[PDB]
């Protein structure tokens, strides 16, 4: 169990696949601009409550979503319609991230957590259209929520959900998170529900989708 709340580059594991690297940049977006971006994205983004599938069952995801990019992204057995026209603010942020981080992106997934009851549960971003060892950038706006990470068990332990290394990363207003290396191969992450009032949170997840 590790807690990370300091600006820095953290190598969270070195095996089995390789180096798992996460980079945190608090205050990447200044408070007032982040406030305005939040208001703007809450009003302008075409937010929808989408369906999931699981295993021959149907349910409403406990979060709103929207997609931007020229290529489709299919998770939870449902495909999101790619949007060719990026919102100008989203473009600007994309370009800012690229120039400052040195990594390029062509796809953006928008998550809106309406209140404390919204969440995304355990998964890895290992969809094959992301390629081998994808680079994923996460930018947060609104209320603070906790980004939890758990290391995957090795195949000898038959997927033991417990006792493996856990990491919690608070994502505050205007904080930028970068994930690279083996992070998607070796770790899972989620955003749990909370038990006290939370204001809405908008999260921007940038990635590269390949043919």
């Amino acid at each position, epitope marked *: 169990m590790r807690v990370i709340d300091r600006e820095g580059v953290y190598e969270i594991s070195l095996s089995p696949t390789g180096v798992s690297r996460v980079c945190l940049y608090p205050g990447f977006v200044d*408070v007032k*601009e982040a406030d305005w*971006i939040l208001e703007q994205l809450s*009003q*302008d983004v075409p937010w929808k409550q989408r369906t999931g599938i699981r295993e021959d069952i149907t349910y409403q995801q406990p979060r709103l979503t929207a997609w931007y990019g020229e290529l489709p992204y299919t998770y939870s057995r449902i495909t999101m319609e790619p949007n060719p026209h990026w919102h*100008p*603010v989203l473009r*600007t942020l994309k370009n800012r991230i690229e120039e400052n981080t040195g990594h390029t992106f062509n796809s953006l997934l928008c998550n809106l957590y309406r209140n404390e009851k919204d969440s995304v549960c355990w998964h890895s971003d290992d969809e094959p259209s992301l390629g081998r060892s994808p680079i994923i950038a996460s930018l947060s706006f609104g209320a603070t929520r906790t980004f939890e990470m758990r290391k995957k068990p090795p195949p000898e332990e038959n997927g033991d959900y417990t006792y493996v290394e856990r990491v919690k990363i608070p994502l505050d207003h205007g904080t930028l998170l970068i994930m690279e290396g083996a992070t998607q191969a070796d770790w899972q992450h989620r955003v749990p529900k909370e038990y006290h009032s939370r204001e809405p949170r908008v999260n921007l997840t940038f990635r590269t989708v390949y043919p």
Partner: antibody
Amino acid sequence: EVQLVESGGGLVQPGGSLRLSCAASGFNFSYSSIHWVRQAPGKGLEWVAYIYSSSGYTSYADSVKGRFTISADTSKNTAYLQMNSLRAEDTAVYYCARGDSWYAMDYWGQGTLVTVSS
Amino acid sequence: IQMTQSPSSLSASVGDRVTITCRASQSVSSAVAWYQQKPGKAPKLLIYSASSLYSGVPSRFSGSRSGTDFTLTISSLQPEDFATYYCQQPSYIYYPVTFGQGTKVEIKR
């Protein structure tokens, strides 16, 4: 009673310069957007620049870029506009307007006259 | 050489319903502001966020959005409502701001 006062306007030769100032009275700057809008006699409004006082970000109009320089001093609660290489078409009434949000301007000044002519 | 245009005119009587439209194609935002300016005075803010009334604005003014078209409607024309109305086009964050063609509303005689 929360007014805005503009100063630094007058008469200048083409290619000359001016420095407009916008003093915030009754309230404060910071965590707000400071806009400059001009209006030629009998014409429509023309936004020329704004600045986000919290971070310092600035954006200018295409008919102004390179020549003007907008700034703000939280220490003095005063916005500035350094207008260089002034041209004849720059003659207009210049307004300074606040704007809680990033666009909605709620406090406007009375405006000062700027005449660029030989 | 001119930068902007002269405001268009609209002849209306007292009590009529006036609906001024503001076209902005390819718009994907609701951040449209409306302003009113009387002769010789600075403009005052009327509507922000396309439809939200500003503090101290009469309830007869109302703004709505229809796709890429934005509108400002006066339900009942009052004598103090005859002035020029300017539409601020969708102002995205980090991007420049543009004011539309003013609409001069004069009283019929």
